[PDB]
Amino acid sequence: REIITLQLGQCGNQIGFEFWKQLCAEHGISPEGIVEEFATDRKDVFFYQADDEHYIPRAVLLDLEPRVIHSILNSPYAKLYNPENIYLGNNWASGFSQGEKIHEDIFDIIDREADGSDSLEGFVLCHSIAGGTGSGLGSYLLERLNDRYPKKLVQTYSVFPNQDEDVVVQPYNSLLTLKRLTQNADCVVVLDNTALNRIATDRLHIQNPSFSQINQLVSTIMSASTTTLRYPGYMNNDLIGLIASLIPTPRLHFLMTGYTPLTTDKTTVLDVMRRLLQPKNVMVSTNHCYIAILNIIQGEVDPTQVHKSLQRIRERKLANFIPWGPASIQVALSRKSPYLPSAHRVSGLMMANHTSISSLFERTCRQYDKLRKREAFLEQFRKEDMFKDNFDEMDTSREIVQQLIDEYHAATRPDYISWG
Amino acid sequence: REIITLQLGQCGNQIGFEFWKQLCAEHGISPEGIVEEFATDRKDVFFYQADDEHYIPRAVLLDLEPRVIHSILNSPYAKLYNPENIYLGNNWASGFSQGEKIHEDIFDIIDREADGSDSLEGFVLCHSIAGGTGSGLGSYLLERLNDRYPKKLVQTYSVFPNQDEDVVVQPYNSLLTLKRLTQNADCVVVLDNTALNRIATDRLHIQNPSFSQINQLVSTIMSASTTTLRYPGYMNNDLIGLIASLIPTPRLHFLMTGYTPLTTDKTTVLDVMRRLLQPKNVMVSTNHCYIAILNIIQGEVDPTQVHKSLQRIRERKLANFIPWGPASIQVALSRKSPYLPSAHRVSGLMMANHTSISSLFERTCRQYDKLRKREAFLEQFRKEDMFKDNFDEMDTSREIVQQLIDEYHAATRPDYISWG
Amino acid sequence: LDVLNKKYSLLDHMQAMRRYLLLGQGDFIRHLMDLLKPELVRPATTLYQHNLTGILETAV
């Protein structure tokens, strides 16, 4: 149904602005809010239908100590949204405490938007893990949202902070945030900073301006993830029906994404399926094995070729995953959007549950434990101090993420009747 | 049939002047009394048909110690009415006692006007609750009118004094007036000062000159309430047929009103029905539930769309009321008046019986009881003293309004077979 | 063939014969089944068509 977006963190507000700009360009919308002259397709999930058919984006921007919001302010696209949903230290506990005291008015804004919406389906989160101000306050808001609304869905888009080092206290912050994400979120879309950075340095020749490109990448991914809802077909035109297949168990809810063209500015679907199963098209980094794989195709498709392609790729066994049970690949189809020039119009997406990200989490589990053992890297922050004088919440999150890694490695085994 | 208007209180005489001016502008009437050059429609209820077709307003102005009546006197609209119907302390008991001694000649004026009218239907009252001089004398006249004419109708338009404070004795006065209004009136149209003040500060940017605007608001409401009589259709062209549906029981006779444009200087009826059910279009402030709802539409209406609109709004369940029985919404239609420029010609009104005003009454019941308990706020007024040396009439009105609130809360329950 | 497909629009009938009747659209159908959840889960001996048509109008 109707989904409200929340955006917080500097990179999160960047990709939210880019996402809304991308959808305004994608649909028949002017940057004033007015419907375009040449506008069939649904805008009834993320866009409020206002008085002059003004598709006002259903978005709530949360920030504290604004810097980039001023750059949002002086823009022609500052008249598309902001019906006054904008509300004005780099520690987790700092942002937690600051969000604690102003929980009421921002929750009042959320309830205001819930009253403004006729229906409700979910709150999708734009998040940056260990982004400083975004950390802690984002976990706090996630806990509040799970508390107040036990009937709605929570989706999280976030990047995982790895740049091969910087901040000595960020693994603690990301660990607490991951503990909150495991318990207080329903489904998590995971992203890696170094992986997207490497792809940006790969297909292009940039080294510094990675933000401006990665905004485009995440915007394309997120819009692709929502295209079958935005452009109505009839397979999984609800969020919940899509998410139900992707989550095999409530302990594994992290989703790996790709994108079939690394650059798209006339191959068949058979080729790009083979491309997508190659890991260079995969944008998120014993044997690691998928549990369940889904793919979504949008382009110029012949309907017989997808069947024979599934036959041939099935027989070729390019799906290097061994499950513990009956779970298999799932196909889906979406519409190519108008008004956008696309060479090689076939474009696909993948949503798969893969165990390999455990190793990435294990990297942080190694790092944090190392800095815990030497104990010269907690640095004695005061917000961390009165929030927890004994710092046993870090031990609690360490317990949870250990259980999580064990659940991962039990899922790697060909039986999940045994647990980890 | 033929209805005579009575106007008393400073704000009541203000809105009476504005109402008569509005109807003179609305109909083909010059401000001398002469029919306009371009004048089909009925003026045979509130306008006497005089010698040069002079539609002389059937109005009786009652005042004591005149101030604003002098401003009425020097006006071009002082020749429309006043065929000598004008007859020259802020306590309830003061105005009661003063009206007591001159009851005879004003009753003689009333009988004179009754003889002047061929038929009679009702006396509609312009009243200001706790307006000082209007209080007490208005209750006295209401009691006299109910006594002398047991065959006629009494309608009361009045505002309820709340400005969030001022006068420490006004809750006593309004309580006695409410006791009289409950027993000696047939149907009451209730208005709130702070609600209309808030709407005036909302749609405009005024803070002081609220009177001049609120006159327009009440005039528009009252004229809208009478339009189907003034502009003849054939549904409920009598007062009594209209009032019969609105009153579900003789204990609940207070009517909530709205107005669909907050400002009207081309939406369909479906939209403005949804607007009218939003409380921002409603001008009067467990679950509070309507008993019976009526609406009146005047504009450019397609007759099939009202049926399908009733279907869709019925299915959407935007009528957040739970009755105890079979009572439902009622639709009505009226004519858009000529000679008045109207953009977005569709305009509607609502008449609904809602329990929420009990809480407002309860606010006064709390306040008066508080000032009764401390007993430093009766102030020992002498008119109050010889009128009642023991002040048990205040206890009597407290008894009645307690019974009234209990009747309200028994009506809130899904059975009214039990009483309160 | 020319007069049949313009004066009576024969082809629009097929296009709406898949999308709706053969459940070819499903934005419509999921909301339709959503609104028809509490009514159709209740036993249909007391079901009469006038309750179906009015909620059908809102859904369409």
Coordinates of all heavy atoms in Angstrom, one line a residue, chain A residues 220-295:
Chain A
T220 N 19.2 4.5 -8.8 CA 18.8 3.5 -9.8 C 18.4 2.2 -9.2 O 17.4 1.6 -9.6 CB 20.0 3.4 -10.8 OG1 21.2 3.2 -10.1 CG2 20.1 4.5 -11.7
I221 N 19.2 1.8 -8.2 CA 18.9 0.5 -7.6 C 17.5 0.5 -6.9 O 16.7 -0.3 -7.1 CB 20.0 0.1 -6.6 CG1 21.2 -0.3 -7.4 CG2 19.6 -1.1 -5.7 CD1 22.5 -0.5 -6.6
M222 N 17.3 1.6 -6.1 CA 16.1 1.7 -5.3 C 14.8 1.9 -6.2 O 13.8 1.2 -6.0 CB 16.2 2.8 -4.3 CG 15.0 3.0 -3.5 SD 15.1 4.4 -2.3 CE 16.5 4.0 -1.3
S223 N 15.0 2.7 -7.2 CA 13.9 2.9 -8.2 C 13.6 1.6 -8.9 O 12.4 1.3 -9.2 CB 14.2 4.0 -9.1 OG 15.4 3.7 -9.9
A224 N 14.6 0.8 -9.3 CA 14.4 -0.5 -9.9 C 13.7 -1.4 -9.0 O 12.8 -2.1 -9.4 CB 15.8 -1.0 -10.3
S225 N 14.0 -1.4 -7.7 CA 13.4 -2.2 -6.7 C 11.9 -1.9 -6.5 O 11.2 -2.7 -6.0 CB 14.1 -2.0 -5.4 OG 13.8 -0.8 -4.8
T226 N 11.5 -0.7 -6.9 CA 10.1 -0.3 -6.8 C 9.4 -0.1 -8.1 O 8.2 0.2 -8.0 CB 10.1 1.1 -6.0 OG1 10.7 2.1 -6.8 CG2 10.8 0.9 -4.7
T227 N 10.0 -0.4 -9.2 CA 9.4 -0.1 -10.5 C 8.1 -0.8 -10.8 O 7.2 -0.2 -11.2 CB 10.4 -0.4 -11.6 OG1 11.6 0.3 -11.4 CG2 9.9 0.0 -13.0
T228 N 8.1 -2.1 -10.4 CA 6.8 -2.9 -10.6 C 5.7 -2.4 -9.8 O 4.5 -2.6 -10.1 CB 7.1 -4.4 -10.3 OG1 5.9 -5.1 -10.6 CG2 7.5 -4.6 -8.9
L229 N 6.0 -1.7 -8.7 CA 4.9 -1.0 -8.0 C 4.6 0.4 -8.6 O 3.5 0.7 -8.8 CB 5.3 -0.8 -6.5 CG 5.5 -2.1 -5.7 CD1 7.0 -2.5 -5.6 CD2 4.9 -1.9 -4.3
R230 N 5.7 1.1 -9.0 CA 5.5 2.4 -9.6 C 4.9 2.3 -11.0 O 4.0 3.1 -11.4 CB 6.8 3.1 -9.7 CG 7.4 3.4 -8.3 CD 8.8 4.1 -8.4 NE 9.8 3.3 -9.1 CZ 10.3 3.5 -10.3 NH1 9.8 4.5 -11.0 NH2 11.2 2.8 -10.8
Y231 N 5.3 1.3 -11.8 CA 4.8 1.0 -13.1 C 4.0 -0.3 -12.9 O 4.6 -1.4 -12.7 CB 5.8 0.8 -14.1 CG 6.4 2.2 -14.5 CD1 7.4 2.8 -13.9 CD2 5.7 2.9 -15.5 CE1 7.9 4.0 -14.2 CE2 6.2 4.2 -15.9 CZ 7.3 4.7 -15.2 OH 7.8 6.0 -15.6
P232 N 2.7 -0.3 -12.9 CA 1.9 -1.4 -12.4 C 1.9 -2.6 -13.4 O 1.5 -2.4 -14.6 CB 0.5 -0.8 -12.2 CG 0.6 0.7 -12.2 CD 1.8 0.9 -13.1
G233 N 2.3 -3.7 -13.0 CA 2.1 -5.0 -13.7 C 1.0 -5.7 -12.9 O 0.0 -5.1 -12.6
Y234 N 1.2 -7.0 -12.6 CA 0.4 -7.6 -11.6 C 1.1 -8.7 -10.7 O 0.4 -9.4 -10.0 CB -0.9 -8.2 -12.3 CG -0.7 -9.2 -13.4 CD1 -0.8 -10.6 -13.1 CD2 -0.4 -8.8 -14.6 CE1 -0.6 -11.5 -14.1 CE2 -0.2 -9.7 -15.7 CZ -0.3 -11.1 -15.4 OH -0.1 -12.0 -16.4
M235 N 2.4 -8.8 -10.8 CA 3.1 -9.7 -10.0 C 3.7 -8.9 -8.9 O 4.6 -8.1 -9.2 CB 4.2 -10.6 -10.7 CG 5.0 -10.0 -11.9 SD 4.6 -10.1 -13.6 CE 2.8 -10.3 -13.7
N236 N 3.3 -9.1 -7.6 CA 3.9 -8.5 -6.4 C 3.8 -7.0 -6.5 O 4.9 -6.3 -6.3 CB 5.3 -9.0 -6.2 CG 5.4 -10.5 -6.0 OD1 6.0 -11.2 -6.8 ND2 4.8 -11.0 -4.9
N237 N 2.7 -6.5 -6.8 CA 2.4 -5.0 -6.7 C 2.2 -4.5 -5.3 O 1.9 -3.3 -5.1 CB 1.3 -4.7 -7.6 CG 1.6 -4.8 -9.1 OD1 0.7 -4.8 -9.9 ND2 2.9 -4.9 -9.4
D238 N 2.4 -5.4 -4.3 CA 2.5 -5.0 -2.9 C 3.9 -5.2 -2.5 O 4.7 -6.0 -3.0 CB 1.6 -5.8 -2.1 CG 1.7 -7.3 -2.3 OD1 2.2 -7.7 -3.4 OD2 1.3 -8.1 -1.5
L239 N 4.4 -4.4 -1.5 CA 5.7 -4.6 -0.9 C 5.7 -5.9 -0.2 O 6.7 -6.7 -0.4 CB 5.9 -3.5 0.1 CG 7.3 -3.5 0.8 CD1 8.4 -3.3 -0.1 CD2 7.3 -2.6 2.0
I240 N 4.7 -6.3 0.6 CA 4.7 -7.4 1.5 C 4.8 -8.7 0.7 O 5.5 -9.7 1.1 CB 3.5 -7.4 2.4 CG1 3.4 -8.6 3.3 CG2 2.2 -7.1 1.6 CD1 2.1 -8.7 4.1
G241 N 4.1 -8.8 -0.5 CA 4.2 -10.0 -1.3 C 5.6 -10.1 -1.9 O 6.0 -11.3 -2.1
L242 N 6.3 -9.0 -2.2 CA 7.7 -9.1 -2.7 C 8.6 -9.6 -1.6 O 9.5 -10.4 -1.8 CB 8.1 -7.8 -3.3 CG 9.4 -7.8 -4.0 CD1 9.3 -8.6 -5.3 CD2 9.9 -6.4 -4.2
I243 N 8.4 -9.0 -0.4 CA 9.4 -9.2 0.7 C 9.2 -10.6 1.3 O 10.2 -11.2 1.8 CB 9.1 -8.1 1.8 CG1 9.4 -6.7 1.2 CG2 10.1 -8.3 3.0 CD1 10.8 -6.6 0.7
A244 N 8.0 -11.2 1.1 CA 7.7 -12.5 1.7 C 8.6 -13.6 1.1 O 9.0 -14.5 1.8 CB 6.2 -12.9 1.5
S245 N 8.8 -13.5 -0.2 CA 9.7 -14.5 -0.9 C 11.2 -14.3 -0.5 O 11.9 -15.3 -0.4 CB 9.5 -14.4 -2.4 OG 10.0 -13.2 -2.9
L246 N 11.6 -13.0 -0.3 CA 13.0 -12.7 -0.1 C 13.5 -13.1 1.2 O 14.7 -13.4 1.4 CB 13.2 -11.2 -0.4 CG 12.8 -10.7 -1.7 CD1 13.0 -9.2 -1.9 CD2 13.5 -11.5 -2.8
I247 N 12.7 -13.1 2.2 CA 13.1 -13.5 3.6 C 12.7 -15.0 3.8 O 11.6 -15.3 3.9 CB 12.4 -12.6 4.6 CG1 12.8 -11.1 4.5 CG2 12.6 -13.1 6.0 CD1 12.2 -10.2 5.5
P248 N 13.7 -15.8 4.0 CA 13.4 -17.2 4.2 C 13.2 -17.6 5.7 O 12.6 -18.6 6.0 CB 14.7 -17.9 3.7 CG 15.8 -16.9 3.9 CD 15.2 -15.6 3.8
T249 N 13.7 -16.7 6.5 CA 13.7 -16.9 8.0 C 13.9 -15.5 8.6 O 14.6 -14.7 8.0 CB 14.7 -17.9 8.5 OG1 14.8 -17.9 9.9 CG2 16.1 -17.6 7.9
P250 N 13.3 -15.2 9.7 CA 13.4 -13.9 10.3 C 14.8 -13.5 10.8 O 15.0 -12.4 11.2 CB 12.4 -13.9 11.5 CG 12.2 -15.4 11.8 CD 12.3 -16.0 10.5
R251 N 15.7 -14.5 10.9 CA 17.0 -14.2 11.3 C 17.9 -13.7 10.1 O 18.9 -13.0 10.3 CB 17.6 -15.4 12.0 CG 16.8 -15.8 13.2 CD 16.9 -15.0 14.5 NE 16.6 -13.5 14.4 CZ 15.7 -12.9 15.1 NH1 15.0 -13.5 16.0 NH2 15.6 -11.6 14.9
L252 N 17.5 -14.1 8.9 CA 18.3 -13.7 7.7 C 17.4 -12.8 6.9 O 16.5 -13.3 6.2 CB 18.8 -14.9 6.9 CG 19.4 -16.1 7.5 CD1 20.2 -16.9 6.4 CD2 20.3 -15.9 8.7
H253 N 17.7 -11.5 7.0 CA 16.8 -10.5 6.3 C 17.6 -9.5 5.6 O 17.1 -8.4 5.3 CB 15.8 -9.8 7.3 CG 16.5 -9.4 8.5 ND1 17.4 -8.3 8.6 CD2 16.4 -9.8 9.8 CE1 17.8 -8.1 9.8 NE2 17.2 -9.0 10.6
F254 N 18.9 -9.8 5.3 CA 19.8 -8.9 4.5 C 19.8 -9.3 3.1 O 20.0 -10.5 2.8 CB 21.2 -8.9 5.2 CG 21.2 -8.5 6.6 CD1 21.0 -9.3 7.6 CD2 21.4 -7.1 6.9 CE1 21.1 -8.9 8.9 CE2 21.5 -6.7 8.2 CZ 21.3 -7.6 9.2
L255 N 19.7 -8.4 2.2 CA 19.4 -8.6 0.8 C 20.6 -8.1 -0.1 O 21.0 -6.9 0.1 CB 18.1 -8.0 0.3 CG 16.9 -8.6 1.0 CD1 15.6 -7.9 0.6 CD2 16.8 -10.1 0.8
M256 N 21.1 -9.0 -0.9 CA 22.2 -8.6 -1.9 C 21.6 -8.2 -3.2 O 20.6 -8.8 -3.7 CB 23.1 -9.8 -2.1 CG 23.5 -10.5 -0.9 SD 24.9 -9.8 0.0 CE 26.2 -10.2 -1.1
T257 N 22.1 -7.0 -3.7 CA 21.5 -6.4 -4.9 C 22.6 -6.4 -6.0 O 23.8 -6.3 -5.7 CB 21.0 -5.0 -4.6 OG1 22.1 -4.2 -4.2 CG2 19.9 -5.1 -3.6
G258 N 22.2 -6.3 -7.2 CA 23.1 -6.1 -8.3 C 22.6 -5.0 -9.2 O 21.6 -4.2 -8.9
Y259 N 23.1 -4.9 -10.4 CA 22.6 -4.1 -11.5 C 23.2 -4.6 -12.8 O 24.5 -4.5 -12.9 CB 22.8 -2.6 -11.4 CG 22.0 -1.8 -12.4 CD1 20.7 -2.2 -12.7 CD2 22.5 -0.7 -12.9 CE1 20.0 -1.5 -13.7 CE2 21.8 0.1 -13.8 CZ 20.6 -0.4 -14.2 OH 19.8 0.4 -15.1
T260 N 22.4 -5.1 -13.8 CA 23.0 -5.7 -15.0 C 23.8 -4.8 -15.9 O 24.9 -5.3 -16.3 CB 21.9 -6.4 -15.8 OG1 20.7 -5.7 -15.7 CG2 21.6 -7.8 -15.2
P261 N 23.5 -3.6 -16.2 CA 24.5 -2.7 -16.9 C 25.3 -2.0 -15.9 O 24.8 -1.3 -15.0 CB 23.6 -1.8 -17.7 CG 22.4 -1.7 -17.0 CD 22.2 -2.9 -16.2
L262 N 26.6 -2.2 -15.9 CA 27.5 -1.3 -15.2 C 27.5 0.1 -15.9 O 27.7 1.1 -15.2 CB 28.9 -1.8 -15.2 CG 29.1 -3.0 -14.2 CD1 30.4 -3.6 -14.3 CD2 28.8 -2.5 -12.8
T263 N 27.3 0.1 -17.2 CA 26.9 1.4 -17.9 C 25.9 1.0 -19.0 O 26.0 0.0 -19.7 CB 28.2 2.0 -18.5 OG1 29.2 2.2 -17.5 CG2 27.8 3.3 -19.2
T264 N 24.8 1.8 -19.1 CA 23.8 1.5 -20.1 C 23.7 2.7 -21.1 O 22.8 2.7 -21.9 CB 22.4 1.2 -19.5 OG1 21.5 1.0 -20.5 CG2 22.0 2.4 -18.6
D265 N 24.6 3.7 -21.0 CA 24.6 4.8 -21.9 C 26.0 4.9 -22.5 O 26.5 4.1 -23.2 CB 24.2 6.1 -21.2 CG 22.7 6.1 -20.8 OD1 21.9 5.5 -21.5 OD2 22.4 6.7 -19.8
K266 N 22.2 -4.3 -28.3 CA 21.0 -5.1 -28.2 C 21.3 -6.6 -27.9 O 21.2 -7.5 -28.7 CB 20.2 -5.0 -29.4 CG 18.7 -5.2 -29.2 CD 18.2 -4.1 -28.2 CE 16.9 -4.6 -27.5 NZ 16.3 -3.6 -26.6
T267 N 21.7 -6.9 -26.6 CA 21.9 -8.2 -26.2 C 20.6 -8.8 -25.7 O 19.6 -8.0 -25.5 CB 22.9 -8.3 -25.0 OG1 22.5 -9.2 -24.0 CG2 23.1 -6.9 -24.4
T268 N 20.5 -10.1 -25.6 CA 19.3 -10.8 -25.2 C 19.3 -11.1 -23.7 O 20.3 -10.8 -23.0 CB 19.1 -12.1 -25.9 OG1 18.0 -12.8 -25.3 CG2 20.4 -12.9 -25.9
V269 N 18.2 -11.6 -23.2 CA 18.1 -11.8 -21.8 C 19.0 -13.0 -21.3 O 19.4 -13.0 -20.1 CB 16.6 -12.0 -21.4 CG1 15.7 -11.1 -22.2 CG2 16.1 -13.5 -21.6
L270 N 19.3 -13.9 -22.2 CA 20.1 -15.0 -21.9 C 21.5 -14.6 -21.5 O 22.1 -15.0 -20.5 CB 20.2 -15.9 -23.1 CG 19.0 -16.8 -23.7 CD1 17.9 -16.0 -24.3 CD2 19.5 -17.7 -24.8
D271 N 22.0 -13.6 -22.3 CA 23.4 -13.1 -22.0 C 23.4 -12.3 -20.7 O 24.4 -12.6 -19.9 CB 23.8 -12.1 -23.2 CG 24.2 -12.9 -24.4 OD1 24.7 -14.0 -24.3 OD2 24.0 -12.3 -25.5
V272 N 22.5 -11.5 -20.4 CA 22.6 -10.6 -19.2 C 22.2 -11.4 -18.0 O 22.6 -11.0 -16.9 CB 21.7 -9.4 -19.4 CG1 22.2 -8.5 -20.5 CG2 20.3 -9.8 -19.6
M273 N 21.5 -12.6 -18.1 CA 21.4 -13.5 -17.0 C 22.8 -14.1 -16.6 O 23.1 -14.1 -15.5 CB 20.4 -14.6 -17.3 CG 19.0 -14.2 -17.1 SD 17.8 -15.2 -18.1 CE 16.2 -14.7 -17.4
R274 N 23.5 -14.5 -17.7 CA 24.9 -15.0 -17.4 C 25.8 -13.9 -16.9 O 26.6 -14.1 -16.0 CB 25.4 -15.5 -18.8 CG 26.8 -16.2 -18.6 CD 27.2 -16.8 -20.0 NE 26.3 -17.8 -20.5 CZ 26.3 -18.3 -21.7 NH1 27.2 -17.9 -22.6 NH2 25.5 -19.3 -22.1
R275 N 25.6 -12.6 -17.3 CA 26.3 -11.5 -16.8 C 26.0 -11.3 -15.3 O 26.9 -11.0 -14.5 CB 26.0 -10.3 -17.6 CG 26.5 -10.3 -19.0 CD 25.9 -9.2 -19.8 NE 25.9 -9.6 -21.3 CZ 25.8 -8.7 -22.3 NH1 25.8 -7.4 -22.0 NH2 25.8 -9.1 -23.5
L276 N 24.7 -11.3 -15.0 CA 24.3 -11.0 -13.6 C 24.8 -12.1 -12.7 O 25.1 -11.7 -11.5 CB 22.7 -10.9 -13.6 CG 22.1 -10.7 -12.3 CD1 22.6 -9.3 -11.8 CD2 20.6 -10.7 -12.4
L277 N 24.8 -13.3 -13.1 CA 25.4 -14.3 -12.3 C 26.9 -14.2 -12.1 O 27.5 -14.9 -11.3 CB 25.0 -15.7 -12.7 CG 23.5 -16.0 -12.6 CD1 23.1 -17.3 -13.3 CD2 23.1 -16.0 -11.2
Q278 N 27.6 -13.4 -13.0 CA 29.0 -13.1 -12.7 C 29.1 -12.0 -11.6 O 28.3 -11.1 -11.6 CB 29.7 -12.7 -14.0 CG 29.7 -13.8 -15.0 CD 30.6 -13.4 -16.2 OE1 31.3 -12.4 -16.1 NE2 30.6 -14.3 -17.2
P279 N 30.0 -12.1 -10.7 CA 30.0 -11.3 -9.5 C 30.4 -9.8 -9.8 O 30.3 -9.0 -8.9 CB 31.0 -12.0 -8.6 CG 32.0 -12.6 -9.5 CD 31.2 -13.0 -10.7
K280 N 30.9 -9.6 -11.0 CA 31.3 -8.2 -11.3 C 30.1 -7.4 -11.6 O 30.2 -6.1 -11.5 CB 32.2 -8.2 -12.6 CG 33.6 -9.0 -12.6 CD 34.1 -9.4 -11.2 CE 35.2 -10.4 -11.4 NZ 35.1 -11.5 -10.4
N281 N 29.0 -8.0 -11.9 CA 27.7 -7.3 -11.9 C 27.0 -7.2 -10.6 O 26.0 -6.5 -10.4 CB 26.8 -8.0 -12.9 CG 27.0 -7.5 -14.3 OD1 27.2 -8.3 -15.3 ND2 26.9 -6.2 -14.5
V282 N 27.5 -8.0 -9.6 CA 27.0 -7.9 -8.2 C 27.8 -6.8 -7.5 O 29.0 -6.8 -7.5 CB 27.2 -9.3 -7.6 CG1 27.2 -9.2 -6.0 CG2 26.1 -10.2 -8.0
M283 N 27.0 -5.9 -6.8 CA 27.6 -4.7 -6.3 C 27.8 -4.8 -4.8 O 28.3 -3.8 -4.2 CB 26.7 -3.5 -6.6 CG 26.5 -3.3 -8.1 SD 25.6 -1.7 -8.4 CE 26.1 -1.4 -10.1
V284 N 27.4 -5.9 -4.1 CA 27.7 -6.1 -2.7 C 28.6 -7.3 -2.5 O 28.3 -8.4 -3.1 CB 26.4 -6.3 -1.9 CG1 26.5 -5.4 -0.6 CG2 25.2 -6.0 -2.7
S285 N 29.7 -7.1 -1.8 CA 30.6 -8.2 -1.6 C 30.1 -9.2 -0.5 O 29.2 -8.8 0.3 CB 32.0 -7.7 -1.2 OG 32.5 -6.8 -2.2
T286 N 35.2 -22.1 3.6 CA 34.2 -22.9 3.0 C 33.5 -22.2 1.8 O 33.9 -21.1 1.4 CB 33.1 -23.3 4.0 OG1 32.1 -24.0 3.3 CG2 32.5 -22.1 4.7
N287 N 32.4 -22.8 1.4 CA 31.6 -22.2 0.3 C 30.5 -21.3 0.9 O 29.9 -21.6 1.9 CB 30.9 -23.2 -0.6 CG 30.3 -22.7 -1.8 OD1 30.5 -21.5 -2.1 ND2 29.7 -23.5 -2.6
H288 N 30.4 -20.1 0.3 CA 29.2 -19.2 0.6 C 28.2 -19.5 -0.4 O 28.4 -19.5 -1.6 CB 29.6 -17.7 0.6 CG 30.1 -17.3 1.9 ND1 29.4 -17.4 3.1 CD2 31.3 -16.7 2.3 CE1 30.1 -16.9 4.1 NE2 31.3 -16.5 3.6
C289 N 26.9 -19.6 0.0 CA 25.9 -20.1 -0.8 C 24.6 -19.2 -0.6 O 24.3 -18.9 0.5 CB 25.6 -21.6 -0.6 SG 25.2 -21.9 1.2
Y290 N 24.0 -18.9 -1.7 CA 22.7 -18.3 -1.6 C 21.6 -19.2 -1.0 O 21.7 -20.4 -1.2 CB 22.2 -17.8 -3.0 CG 23.2 -16.9 -3.7 CD1 24.1 -17.5 -4.6 CD2 23.2 -15.6 -3.6 CE1 25.1 -16.7 -5.2 CE2 24.1 -14.8 -4.2 CZ 25.0 -15.3 -5.1 OH 25.9 -14.5 -5.7
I291 N 20.7 -18.6 -0.3 CA 19.5 -19.3 0.1 C 18.4 -19.2 -0.9 O 17.8 -20.2 -1.4 CB 19.0 -18.9 1.5 CG1 20.1 -19.0 2.5 CG2 17.8 -19.6 1.9 CD1 20.6 -20.5 2.7
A292 N 18.1 -18.0 -1.3 CA 17.0 -17.7 -2.3 C 17.4 -16.6 -3.2 O 17.9 -15.6 -2.7 CB 15.7 -17.5 -1.6
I293 N 17.1 -16.7 -4.5 CA 17.5 -15.7 -5.4 C 16.3 -15.3 -6.2 O 15.4 -16.1 -6.5 CB 18.6 -16.3 -6.4 CG1 19.8 -16.7 -5.6 CG2 19.0 -15.3 -7.5 CD1 20.8 -17.5 -6.5
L294 N 16.1 -14.0 -6.4 CA 15.1 -13.4 -7.2 C 15.7 -12.5 -8.2 O 16.7 -11.9 -8.0 CB 14.0 -12.7 -6.4 CG 12.6 -12.6 -7.0 CD1 11.6 -12.9 -5.9 CD2 12.4 -11.3 -7.6
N295 N 15.1 -12.3 -9.4 CA 15.5 -11.4 -10.4 C 14.3 -10.7 -11.0 O 13.2 -11.2 -11.1 CB 16.4 -12.0 -11.5 CG 15.5 -12.8 -12.4 OD1 15.1 -13.9 -12.1 ND2 15.3 -12.3 -13.6

